[PDB]
Amino acid sequence: HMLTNLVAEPFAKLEQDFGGSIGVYAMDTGSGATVSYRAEERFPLCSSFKGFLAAAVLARSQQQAGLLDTPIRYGKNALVPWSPISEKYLTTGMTVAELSAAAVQYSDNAAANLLLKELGGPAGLTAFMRSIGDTTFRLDRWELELNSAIPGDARDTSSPRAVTESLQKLTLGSALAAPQRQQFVDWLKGNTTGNHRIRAAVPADWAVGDKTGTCGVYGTANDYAVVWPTGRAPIVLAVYTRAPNKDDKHSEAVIAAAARLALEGLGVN
Ligand SMILES: Cn1c(=O)cc(CP(=O)(O)O)c2cc(F)c(N3CCCC3)cc21
């Protein structure tokens, strides 16, 4: 509204310096006030689906109790590049919950693919997001192919506004049962990969859970987070980037700066 107008110039200058596109949607869950910048444009999800993948695994777990406990066996073939946890448990296998934790907190690529299989593949995760009223989200492909981040390709994309709206439902709304909800929040709170992104703009005395995504091409990287400032309502926000050239580099500093501007535009500072 009027807060989106305030931050337009600062965002324009930030993305001009970055040399690509920044997408931001930030919601004050108390006032319902919002900051938007390219909030309805598609950006590649990269690893950021792994968070919604974990919440879909949890949603299913509310039907079939013992799902989270189920051991999963896998071979060397499952181990696609950046599977830092699953590669340690190849000879033993892991449970669904451990794969979910690995996928959210270490962004583990084998773990994601193994969990995708369990839900009916990318169409299965998409089906879950449709069920919580997200008509924007689409996953099409698997790790690593979903990372192509091809300009104008809608495959494996969502919008910052849909990402924030869906995150609010799954972390703070009624989309999950309270146990699965608090479990989702706790995997996000325990994320190890986001220290240089939204977390870098969040004071140390505020709770935060996040999931990162990094495609490795087209300056395409992102983060979404729930943030619990002290003595005010939680903030939910999504910060997505991409860039026009394949060889363009992503910037964690740009994501952190975009998060600062979002929080500043909401006046939470
Ligand atoms: C370059 N780079 C990172 O910096 C961080 C991450 C972790 P996250 O931010 O995604 O959660 C990362 C993940 C990949 F799968 C990745 N591949 C590069 C080729 C295809 C994907 C690079 C990554």
What are the extents of the domains in the chain? 2-268
Stated in angstroms to one decimal place, the resolution of this structure is 1.8
- Do strands 157-158 and 207-214 pair parallel, antiparallel, or not at all (unpaired)? unpaired
Active site residue 47: yes
Specify the ligand 1 atom closest to the Cα of 223: 9
**Residue entry with tokens 């593949």:** 121
- Spelled out in words, what is the top-level CATH class assigned to the domain 2-268? alpha beta
Ligand 1 atom 21, closest CA: 215
Q: Which residues line ligand 1 (CB under 6 A)?
A: 46-47, 82, 107, 109, 144, 147, 193, 212-216
CB 114 within 8 A of CB 122: no
Give yes or no for a cis peptide into 144 (omega within 30° of 0): yes
- Here the tokens at position 55 are 């919440």
* Cβ contacts of 92 within 8 Å, gap of 6 or more: none
